[PDB]
RNA sequence: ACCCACUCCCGACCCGGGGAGGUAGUGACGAAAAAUAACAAUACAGGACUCUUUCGAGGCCCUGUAAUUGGAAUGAGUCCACUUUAAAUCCUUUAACGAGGAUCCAUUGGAGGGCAAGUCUGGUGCCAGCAGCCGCGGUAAUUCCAGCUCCAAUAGCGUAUAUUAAAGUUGCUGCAGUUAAAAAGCUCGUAGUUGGAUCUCUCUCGGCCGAAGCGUUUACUUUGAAAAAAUUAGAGUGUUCAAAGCAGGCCGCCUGGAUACCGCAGCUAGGAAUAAUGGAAUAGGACCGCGGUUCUAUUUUGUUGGUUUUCGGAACUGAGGCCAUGAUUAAGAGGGACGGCCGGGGGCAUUCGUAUUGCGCCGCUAGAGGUGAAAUUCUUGGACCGGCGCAAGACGGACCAGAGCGAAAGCAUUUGCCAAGAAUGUUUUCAUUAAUCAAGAACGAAAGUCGGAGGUUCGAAGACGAUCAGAUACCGUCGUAGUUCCGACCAUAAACGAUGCCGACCGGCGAUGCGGCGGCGUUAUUCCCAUGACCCGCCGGGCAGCUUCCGGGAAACCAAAGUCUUUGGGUUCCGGGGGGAGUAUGGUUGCAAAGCUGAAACUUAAAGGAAUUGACGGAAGGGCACCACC
């Protein structure tokens, strides 16, 4: 059992503090290795330059080509792969243009049948992909 | 349970409820005191004195006849031993085990039992130093402890 | 089962128990006055004696220590006290 | 070794009452045990008890009337102020209609309602309901 | 951008200055209020607390695509004049214009489940895509792309990320640790944590009537001081309501601008349970009067002087009176002594037993090993077998058990010596000395390392022979290190009861091991008692077993793995989805092998536990049919 003494506060507090490091989420948040490894570096979004269009194969139970883009982030020169969500939206992206990319929704984890992809394109050339998809706006010329 | 064994024995003395002197016992308190003095002069520890008085002279409990315990009587008369008899016997047992281990170096069981004995010695000596029964500088060293025996 | 109760007698259930586990603990031993046929005086001996006691006027072995209750010699008449 | 003789006494009373026994033996007895038992009995939760006096440490034979659901000890004896009493009652008691928290205060050993009447706090010994 | 008009500040100053500050601008950070319609008349529909007749009669209350009809209402907007203000703007106020498809048009996400709301239609056809998760899509897709319809919030709604609750998935409240992740191999041990019972009228007085403590300390609890505002809580107050604000109210007067909380530490005063702590044990102990010493702020209205020969204070000691003189009990806590036993517990020495291998001699003889068959191997230099001896090195059968001992690892021929130990017995002794344990330490199977001795057997490696598609393996014949002992190292095991230790409580039964107690009777000591072996019980530890709706648990199952949401006896170690991985790296230990400590990036929706039903089994046991056999 655990100690129950009026003078065990140091023991209890210290044991809790040592045992909190075996919490995966607590350790990931407080160790600093995950923040260093994060390409966004703690940001919610990041602007990058599209290097090439890459087609990502959906995982084995499904079958599709997930149209992604490799982008290089302006802030730190890191190369990530970002999903271009809707259909025909890869046609809205050219090569060597600026795109705003956000997380994919799992806080750094891959989503669905898209291996190794944890980012999605939000804007292209300072125009949202939703506006171009719905026809509300057109990419600049 | 035992301090140094997995034993959970229950065997011990069971004092009777009555604290009075037995009706059969005709020795005066001073008579028991002189018998205690004689037995101490013979060279006996208070436990041995109590055992002899119980077995032969019918003194069921010295504390109930004389109103005092055997060690207190020995101290008050001035013939109590230098160090308490439990610690003395623990040191004697340690000395015996060390003498055996000197000529039997492959006896790991003897070494383990010596460790237990010296731990008991140290605990008792610390308790006695707390009660000012032993001088605060007293220490059990296994180099000339046979002289203490 | 309804402890310390006079309605159901239990001398027999109390002296059967362990001496320490009784309602009020009490020894299972006793002191006994011993006459030796060759002697002429009382000797009060503990039942569970650990000493080879001798007659106070002679050199006769009154009793010998055993694992429990001491073993008395033949002919010595022993009677418990109290 | 045994600490907290009151914990042993309360656990024994609880175990005996859960088996439906009419009496329970408690050893060793102590002043705190006797006061806690008196508090329990004044509220009709145990009944009469007898203190067997042996010359070392007494025993208690407690007559059980099956009105007791749980008698428990709170270790350590946390200091309780009059403000913390409501939170302790919410934590320990099964209802605001019945059940008692026993405290040792400078005014004696008493339930929580009596401690509120005398406007005193103290240290929590245990509870019963 | 405008201004010192407000709030305040500065200067020699009523006067000047202030990008402090105020005002406006941009502003879906965010917060409050709040439009996008309301109503009536006919036609339906619904019910009636209407006739009643479920045919029907029905402007009683209602509902709708009427995209029917009709008027009433209003502010978004435009604009005028005030008002606002330093000047303006914005609100507020007034007038004019301002609504019918009131086109003066509400959006953002969804419609398989979680989760509210379409297996409607068209397209696509594992593509395109959706999908937080499960999943959808491979020719009716309830899920993609659309149309329609529906629903959720609504001037807002979706997405990413940080964080809180959910998470009793960090557990103080309040989690787990036999098998799901997990208790150190095992003991000792300092700190830490936790600790059995017990003790119920004293200083100057003009109110027994102002006061002192000079005596024994704290924790706790209650109280009283002191403690910025703003924020939070909270009293009052119709901002048109509300967020707010600190205002305001009445016919010049009345009134507010409260109050609470403010943890810990510090200060203060009552209480005295609980918890710690203290005195008297060589009495250099309490009270009491005596023997002895001092300028002792006066013990000289007189010029002090040597007439302060002295109450009051700091000593050292003696004789006394006096304490009811002063030691709680003796834990079903612990240590120690003592008694008779007990055990494959340990060390040293000693002895015996066959077996195996080898050697010598004798006899007979051509085979003997070995195998699922063989072959490799030995063999007329006489093998195998039988007999008599000798030697060596191992090991200690049967007895031998759900029996014993040990901290665990582990421990079995006889005898002796050496020290140790549990339990029991105890009207012995000490008297809290205890429990658990960071640091530290002892021991720790097997294998392994170094040195020495030995080397029977078995035998990693290796050689050969087989089996096989292949075998590098299983099987066979040999065989090195090793296996044995001595001295150093290593410190790991499915080191397991996969189950920490200490304490209490909660069923039954029969056994068994040790000790003790009691008792018909049977045997041996060839005689009295005793002592053994039995028999029948009881008590205490111990290894276990059976049983049981104690209770628990996911169950298996467990009298503990119970006394757990009715949750708190004490304490140590330790787990937090599966992998990466007990890996990398650093430190440390080791001669080495390696041991201890021990990540992260990344990857993933399960991995796992227990039990159930099937299927299968180169698992066992049955049954049947001349499509089985005899």
Curated annotation (Swiss-Prot), chain A:
Subcellular location as annotated: Cytoplasm, Cytosol; Cytoplasm; Rough endoplasmic reticulum; Nucleus, Nucleolus
Modified residues (N6-succinyllysine): 53
Keywords: Acetylation, Cytoplasm, Deafness, Disease variant, Dwarfism, Endoplasmic reticulum, Hydroxylation, Isopeptide bond, Nucleus, Ribonucleoprotein, Ribosomal protein, Ubl conjugation
Family matches, as PROSITE patterns: RIBOSOMAL_S12
Known outcome of mutating residue 119 to I: In BTDD; decreases hydroxylation of the protein; decreases the accuracy of translation; decreases levels of incorporation of the mutant protein into polysomes; patient cells become highly sensitive to oxidative stress
Keyword NADP: no
SUPFAM superfamilies: Nucleic acid-binding proteins (SSF50249)
Record field: compositional bias (Basic residues): 1-19
GO biological process: cytoplasmic translation; maintenance of translational fidelity; ribosomal small subunit biogenesis; stress granule assembly; translation
Keyword Hydrolase part of the UniProt annotation: no
UniProt cross-link Glycyl lysine isopeptide (Lys-Gly) (interchain with G-Cter in SUMO2), position: 36
Spans annotated as Disordered: 1-25
Modification N6-acetyllysine occurs at: 134
InterPro entries found in the cross-reference section: NA-bd_OB-fold, Ribosomal_uS12, Ribosomal_uS12_euk/arc
Signal sequence region: none
GO cellular component, one term: small-subunit processome
Family per similarity comment: Belongs to the universal ribosomal protein uS12 family.
NCBIfam families listed in its UniProt record: PRK04211.1, uS12_E_A
Full protein name: Small ribosomal subunit protein uS12
Curated annotation (Swiss-Prot), chain B:
Organism of this sequence: Homo sapiens
Similarity annotation: Belongs to the universal ribosomal protein uS15 family.
One Gene Ontology term of the molecular function aspect: structural constituent of ribosome
Cross-link type Glycyl lysine isopeptide (Lys-Gly) (interchain with G-Cter in SUMO2), residue numbers: 42
Protein's UniProt keywords contain Ribonucleoprotein: yes
Coiled coil: none
Post-translational modification N6-acetyllysine, affected residues: 26
Alphabetic keyword roster: Acetylation, Cytoplasm, Isopeptide bond, Nucleus, Phosphoprotein, Ribonucleoprotein, Ribosomal protein, Ubl conjugation
Subunit structure as annotated in this protein's UniProt entry: Component of the small ribosomal subunit. Part of the small subunit (SSU) processome, composed of more than 70 proteins and the RNA chaperone small nucleolar RNA (snoRNA) U3.
SUPFAM superfamilies attached to this UniProt entry: S15/NS1 RNA-binding domain (SSF47060)
GO cellular component, one term: cytosol
Compartment(s): Cytoplasm; Nucleus, Nucleolus
Cross-link (Glycyl lysine isopeptide (Lys-Gly) (interchain with G-Cter in ubiquitin)): 26
InterPro entries with a match to the protein in the record: Ribosomal_uS15 (IPR000589), Ribosomal_uS15_arc_euk (IPR023029), Ribosomal_uS15_N (IPR012606), uS15_NS1_RNA-bd_sf (IPR009068)
Presence of keyword Cytoplasm: yes
Source species, domain of life: Eukaryota
Functional note: Component of the small ribosomal subunit. The ribosome is a large ribonucleoprotein complex responsible for the synthesis of proteins in the cell. Part of the small subunit (SSU) processome, first precursor of the small eukaryotic ribosomal subunit. During the assembly of the SSU processome in the nucleolus, many ribosome biogenesis factors, an RNA chaperone and ribosomal proteins associate with the nascent pre-rRNA and work in concert to generate RNA folding, modifications, rearrangements and cleavage as well as targeted degradation of pre-ribosomal RNA by the RNA exosome.
Modified residues (Phosphoserine): 29
PTM-bearing positions, type N6-succinyllysine: 26, 33
Positions of post-translational Phosphotyrosine modification: 37
Protein name, as recorded: Small ribosomal subunit protein uS15
Curated annotation (Swiss-Prot), chain C:
Chief location bin: cytoplasm
Binding note for cofactor: Binds 1 zinc ion per subunit.
Cofactors that this protein relies on: Zn(2+)
Ranges that cross the membrane: none
Compartments in which it is found: Cytoplasm; Nucleus, Nucleolus
Location of region: Disordered: 1-22
GO biological process entries: cytoplasmic translation; ribosomal small subunit assembly; ribosomal small subunit biogenesis; rRNA processing; translation
A GO CC term assigned to this protein in UniProt: cytosolic small ribosomal subunit
Positions annotated as zinc finger (C4-type): 36-58
GO molecular function: DNA binding; RNA binding; structural constituent of ribosome; zinc ion binding
Alphabetically ordered keywords of this record: Cytoplasm, Diamond-Blackfan anemia, Metal-binding, Nucleus, Phosphoprotein, Ribonucleoprotein, Ribosomal protein, Zinc, Zinc-finger
Function description: Component of the small ribosomal subunit. The ribosome is a large ribonucleoprotein complex responsible for the synthesis of proteins in the cell. Required for proper rRNA processing and maturation of 18S rRNAs. Part of the small subunit (SSU) processome, first precursor of the small eukaryotic ribosomal subunit.
Subunit composition and interactions: Component of the small ribosomal subunit. Part of the small subunit (SSU) processome, composed of more than 70 proteins and the RNA chaperone small nucleolar RNA (snoRNA) U3.
Protein family: Belongs to the eukaryotic ribosomal protein eS27 family.
Name of the featured protein: Small ribosomal subunit protein eS27
Source species: Homo sapiens (Human)
Taxonomic path: Eukaryota, Metazoa, Chordata, Craniata, Vertebrata
Gene designation per UniProt: RPS27
Curated annotation (Swiss-Prot), chain D:
Record-linked InterPro entries: Ribosomal_uS8, Ribosomal_uS8_CS, Ribosomal_uS8_sf
Keyword presence, Nucleus: yes
Transmembrane segments: none
Pfam family, one: Ribosomal_S8
Superkingdom classification of source: Eukaryota
Entry's localization field: Cytoplasm; Nucleus, Nucleolus
Residue numbers bearing the N6-succinyllysine modification: 87
A GO MF label: RNA binding
Function according to Swiss-Prot or TrEMBL: Component of the small ribosomal subunit. Part of the small subunit (SSU) processome, first precursor of the small eukaryotic ribosomal subunit. During the assembly of the SSU processome in the nucleolus, many ribosome biogenesis factors, an RNA chaperone and ribosomal proteins associate with the nascent pre-rRNA and work in concert to generate RNA folding, modifications, rearrangements and cleavage as well as targeted degradation of pre-ribosomal RNA by the RNA exosome. Required for proper erythropoiesis.
Subunit annotation: Component of the 40S ribosomal subunit. Part of the small subunit (SSU) processome, composed of more than 70 proteins and the RNA chaperone small nucleolar RNA (snoRNA) U3.
Family stated for the protein in its record: Belongs to the universal ribosomal protein uS8 family.
Name used for this protein in its record: Small ribosomal subunit protein uS8
Species of the source: Homo sapiens
């Amino acid at each position: 059992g655990k100690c129950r003494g009026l003078r065990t506060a140091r023991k209890l507090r210290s044991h809790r503090r040592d045992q909190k490091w075996h919490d995966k989420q607590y350790k990931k948040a407080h160790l600093g290795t995950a923040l260093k490894a994060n390409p966004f570096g703690g940001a919610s979004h990041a602007k990058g330059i599209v290097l090439e269009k890459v087609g990502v194969e959906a995982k084995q139970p499904n079958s599709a080509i997930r149209k992604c883009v490799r982008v290089q982030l302006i802030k730190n020169g890191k190369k990530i792969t970002a999903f271009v969500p809707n259909d025909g939206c890869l046609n809205f992206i050219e090569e060597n243009d600026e795109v705003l990319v956000a997380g994919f929704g799992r806080k750094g984890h891959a989503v669905g049948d898209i291996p190794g992809v944890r980012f999605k394109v939000v804007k292209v050339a300072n125009v949202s992909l939703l506006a171009l998809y719905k026809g509300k706006k057109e990419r600049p010329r | 349970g035992r301090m140094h064994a997995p034993g959970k024995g229950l065997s011990q003395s069971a004092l009777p409820y009555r604290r009075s002197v037995p009706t059969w016992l005709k020795l005066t308190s001073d008579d028991v005191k002189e018998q205690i003095y004689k037995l101490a002069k013979k060279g006996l520890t208070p436990s041995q004195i109590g055992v002899i008085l119980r077995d032969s002279h019918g003194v069921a409990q010295v504390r109930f006849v004389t109103g005092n315990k055997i060690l207190r009587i020995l101290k008050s008369k001035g013939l109590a031993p230098d160090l308490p008899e439990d610690l003395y016997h623990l040191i004697k047992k340690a000395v015996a085990v060390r003498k055996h281990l000197e000529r039997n170096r492959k006896d790991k069981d003897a070494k383990f039992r010596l460790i237990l004995i010296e731990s008991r010695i140290h605990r008792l000596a610390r308790y006695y130093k707390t009660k000012r029964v032993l001088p605060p500088n007293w220490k059990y060293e296994s180099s000339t402890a046979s002289a203490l025996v | 089962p309804l402890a310390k109760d006079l309605l159901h007698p239990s001398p027999e259930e109390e002296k059967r128990k362990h001496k320490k586990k009784r309602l009020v603990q009490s020894p299972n031993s006793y002191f006994m006055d011993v006459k030796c046929p060759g002697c002429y005086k009382i000797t009060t001996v503990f039942s569970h004696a650990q000493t080879v006691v001798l007659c106070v006027g002679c050199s006769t072995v009154l009793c010998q220590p055993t694992g429990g209750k001491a073993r008395l010699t033949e002919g010595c008449s022993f009677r418990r006290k109290q | 070794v045994r600490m907290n003789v009151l914990a042993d006494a309360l656990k024994s009373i609880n175990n005996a009452e859960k088996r439906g026994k009419r009496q329970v033996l408690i050893r060793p007895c102590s002043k705190v045990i006797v006061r806690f038992l008196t508090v329990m009995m004044k509220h009709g939760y145990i009944g009469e008890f007898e203190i067997i006096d042996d010359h070392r440490a007494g025993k208690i034979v407690v007559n059980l009337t099956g009105r007791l659901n749980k008698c428990g000890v709170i270790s350590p004896r946390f200091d309780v102020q009059l403000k913390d009493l409501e939170k302790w009652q919410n934590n320990l008691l099964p209802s605001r209609q019945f059940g008692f928290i026993v405290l040792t205060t400078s005014a004696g050993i008493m339930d929580h309602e009596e401690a509120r009447r005398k406007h005193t706090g103290g240290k929590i010994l245990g509870f019963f309901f």
